[PDB]
Amino acid sequence: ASKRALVILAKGAEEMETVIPVDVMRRAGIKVTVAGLAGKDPVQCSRDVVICPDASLEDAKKEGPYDVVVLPGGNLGAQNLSESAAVKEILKEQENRKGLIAAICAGPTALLAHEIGFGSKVTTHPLAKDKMMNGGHYTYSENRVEKDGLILTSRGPGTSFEFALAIVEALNGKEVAAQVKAPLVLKD
Amino acid sequence: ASKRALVILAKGAEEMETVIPVDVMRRAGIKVTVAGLAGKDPVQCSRDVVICPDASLEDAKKEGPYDVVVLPGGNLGAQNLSESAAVKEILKEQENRKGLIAAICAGPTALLAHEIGFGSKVTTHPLAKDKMMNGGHYTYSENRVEKDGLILTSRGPGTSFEFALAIVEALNGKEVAAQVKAPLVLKD
């Protein structure tokens, strides 16, 4: 009866955008797998924080399906996600089974690379807007969190808490999200 | 001409309260050392995120002095900090040379354990207030960030961004903090 989340961690990922959703989701009782794109080895993030993944993406792929697939941001991390065929397969499969896909900051540009969710309303970091909008395949929003169908996007490191709580609300409902939120001492 | 920050990382630390200040401080051009309390080995944080420290505390101790010493929270992490003689020595030395000491959430309870900054106004997570106030050695504040002399404290995971930017402002000034803040997409 336990919901399950896959967080894909690549070199150059924004470490705040990785750790906040992982932390918050586990506070919500979600079983989270931090999967290394390149393997089980430690991942150097964009600001040189080094995180040990729970598993390789290859192994995590075999233990699906996941209720949410989470793509952190970071410019170089998002580029690595955009170039990976394994990520394409995971995302297309998630789209087909109508599972939730969540991406933050530069992360959403990987959806464009893999032709995921065309026609959806999405947001990105302001610096990633032009890249995301190449071709006009999505409609752009400036909301701090945006959810359209099964696509949930957010803008930046400072929206990470709202991004993570939106995932919790989508998976576990509004009451659990409110319960998890109170001990965090968030402003709003 | 480069400011230097020491972040002490112990098992059970709150990983969000560790990564956010490290990330933000490096964005500000501060040279940050994440030092493992127990050694160079990977540290399992309170929500099972595993972080590889830059160095052992023993080695980082020899490469001082630091313009700021940062104590993350997490109940079990703060207890480990409170029990460590090496932390006591580092903090007493920092207090003597009038360097900045910064602690968040449960982290400030380590200041009480080591008799640091008595007489200062401090804040904690609400759940750590009674522990911090044992003996009436400090004056309690409910401000999200509190700075009294060389003691800078903050309340919880959701205050981590304000906590980190206060460090940047104290070290590098208000203009650098504002410059670092804008790309984060913080609400206020």
Q: Which domains does chain B have, with CATH numbers?
A: 1-187 (3.40.50.880)
β-bridge mates for residue A140, sequence order: A122
Give the tokens for residue A153: 């996007």
Residue showing tokens 């997490």: B74
B15/A15 touch (CB, cutoff 8 Å), yes or no: no
d(CA B186, CA A111): 24
The resolution, in Å, is 2.0
CA distance B32 to B15: 16
Residue A146 in contact with residue A123, Cβ under 8 Å?
yes
CB-neighbour burial class of residue B74 (10 A; exposed 0-12, middle 13-18, buried 19+)? buried
**Terminal-to-terminal C-alpha distance of chain A:** 30
- CA angle, A30 as apex, A25 and A34 as ends, to 5°? 70
Residue positions of A annotated with a catalytic role: 105, 125
Q: At what angle do helices A160-172 and A174-181 cross, to 10 degrees?
A: 140
B187–A144 C-beta distance less than 8 A: yes
Closest CA to B60 of B4, B12, B21, B18: B4
CA dihedral B3, B12, A58, A164 (to 10 degrees): -80
- Determine the Cα–Cα distance for residues B165 and B181; give it in Å rounded to an integer: 8
- Put simply, the answer to whether B159 touches A19 (Cβ < 8 Å) is no
Residue A141 DSSP code = -
Verify cis geometry, omega within 30 degrees of 0, for the bond prior to A42: no
Buried b / exposed e over A107-117, threshold 16 CB at 10 Å, is: bbbbbbbbebb
d(CA A122, CA A115): 14
* Chain A residues with CB-CB distance to B26 below 8 A: 47-48
- Calpha distance A164→A158 (Å, rounded): 11
DSSP code, position B74: -
**Neighbouring C-beta atoms of residue B79, cutoff 10 Å:** 17
Q: Determined by which method?
A: X-ray
Residues of chain A with C-beta less than 8 angstroms from the C-beta of B20: 16, 20
* CA angle (B106, B111, B113) in 5-degree steps: 95
Angle at B187 between CA B182 and CA B188, to 5 degrees: 80
What number of CA atoms fall less than 13 Å from residue A9's CA on the CB side? 34
Cβ-defined contacts of B37-43 (< 8 Å, 24+): B37/B8, B37/B9, B37/B10, B37/B11, B37/B80, B37/B81, B37/B84, B37/B86, B37/B87, B38/B10, B38/B11, B42/A42, B42/A52, B43/B9, B43/B10, B43/B11, B43/B13
b/e for B28-45, b at 16 or more Cβ within 10 A? Answer: bebebbbbbbeeeebbeb
CB B177 within 8 A of CB B169: yes
Picking from A32, A24, A27, the residue whose alpha carbon sits closest to that of residue A69 is: A32
Which residue is it, tokens 């400030």?
B108
